[model samples]
Target: MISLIAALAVDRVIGMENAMPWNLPADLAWFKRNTLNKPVIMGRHTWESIGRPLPGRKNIILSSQPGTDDRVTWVKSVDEAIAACGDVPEIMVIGGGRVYEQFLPKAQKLYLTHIDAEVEGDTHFPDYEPDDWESVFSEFHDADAQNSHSYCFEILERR
Candidate 1:
């Protein structure tokens, strides 16, 4: 099954200048916990934004770039990324806008952290119909000294 994980502001803003606009430690921890030990598929831009392959997970980059590293596999398509995962039952699509738009249609689950405030961003999460998904779980959190925004972690399954 394919799942997507993202943290978006109230207006669906995800990134500004290829970087997150806010610092939220808890949200980062949530992402790490869920994506660890899974095959993570991301676009070339997303990979570049991250600057390096994430540890503790199979990093699969979907790009036409002809190169490979000890920690990352460069592929040209989503299917190739999934194929590279072998028998892993769930693959996580971690993104920067464009990648999310491409996989949203086929994604079976979404692990989202919805932030309360809106900020300027060049990248935005794709729009989806409310009827197409159902929230299965949600937990609200307040911002603290270590985190910049109050947010809610939600799990939405395709309906």
Candidate 2:
């Protein structure tokens, strides 16, 4: 499966000045559940958001230039990154804004955590028509000790 995963705010804010704007470990719990043992691809900005490699997954960065880290795969273009995924059972596209916009068109599945607030952010998710996707699962989570905002985890399949 070709998937894109993100935790975005109601206004589609995905990051603020290169960092995720909210504190939600619950979101991380869910993100790890699906992404574990998979090849998670992203852009250089997203990799910068996460300074180190994610421990349980293969990290692939889509960039015009090379990254020195031996733990992650660096490719010069979107097609090259997707090609690198090859026959892996699934490839999860984690993001900075531009990578999402670049890969969303080819995505077959989506794992999204939609947060309840419209907070400040310099980057946002691209627009996608709801009609083009079929919701497969959705569960709402209320804010609690480990999280700062109420959010809904949703799964979608492109039509």
Candidate 3:
């Protein structure tokens, strides 16, 4: 499965500046639970935001700039990103706004956490038809001391 994992505000605000607008470990744990051990594909900005290649998984990062890292393979194009995955059973697309839009048409599943609040952001997730997807699992969480806002975790598969 080519799966996308993200946390977005209800208005589709995915990121502000180069990073997400909020810090939520609950979502991070949820992110790792699904992506761990998977061959993860991410755009250059997303990779930069993480500060390093994610440990415990293969990292295929899109970058036009020349660079080298033992922990990751940097590619200049999306096709290069795909070719790097080879026969991996699950290819995870961890995002930056533009990266998600580029892969949305080809992606089969989405692991989304909808932040239940209004927010302002310069970056946003690409919009898609709701009728084309069907939810398989969903759970909600309230805001707390640790997590800044209420959120709903939902898994959607292309219908």
Candidate 4:
């Protein structure tokens, strides 16, 4: 199964100035819990924004640029990235907006952290019709001193 993982603000914004606008450690932990030890496919810009290959997972980068590293696999297309996963039952598409838009139609599941606050961002999550997906699981978390905003962790499957 191909899945998409993202943390989106109430306004559907995902990032600003090439970085996530919010600092939610618990949300990051949720992401790691879901994607760890699996294949994670991301766009070149996402990889650069992250600054390193995420440990404990295979990092597959989709890019036309020339760069090579033993820690990462560079692929020209999403299909190529998916192929690199071999027999992994579920591969994650963790992204920037363009990459998410490319894979949204193909994703069978979505893991989303929905922040309650509106954020100023240059990048936004791809628009999707609510009727096309069904929420399978959802957990709400209240904001504490460490976490800036209240949010919900939701898992949706395509209907």
- Per-residue lDDT tens digits for candidate 2, residues 1-159, read 789998899789896233344557777788889999999898898787788899888889887877778788999998888888788998999897899898899899989999898787788888899999999999998987777678999999998
lDDT of each: 0.84, 0.85, 0.84, 0.87
In candidate 4 the C-alpha lDDT for residue 16 amounts to 23
Prediction 1 global C-alpha lDDT:
0.84
lDDT of 3 by residue, 36-151 (tens): 99888988887777788788988988888885676799889988888898988889998988899999998999999888777777778889887999999999999888787889
The alpha-carbon deviation from the true structure for residue 70 of candidate 2, after best TM-score superposition, in angstroms, is 2.1
Candidate 1 lDDT, tens digit per residue, 38-91? 999988887877888788999988888675555788888877878987898899
Model 4 lDDT per residue over 1-159, tens place = 999999999779885233344567888789899999999998888887788889999999999976666679999987888999899889999998999999999999999999888777788889998899999999999988878789999999999
Which residue segments of model 2 deviate by more than 4 Å?
16-21
Candidate 4: worst-modelled 10 consecutive residues by lDDT: 15-24
Candidate with the larger TM-score of 3 and 4: 4
Clashes of each: 0, 0, 0, 0
Which candidate achieves the best lDDT against the true structure?
A: 4
Model 3 residue 6 distance off true place after TM-score fit, in angstroms: 0.8
**TM-score of each candidate?**
0.91, 0.93, 0.90, 0.93
Model 2 gets an lDDT of 0.85
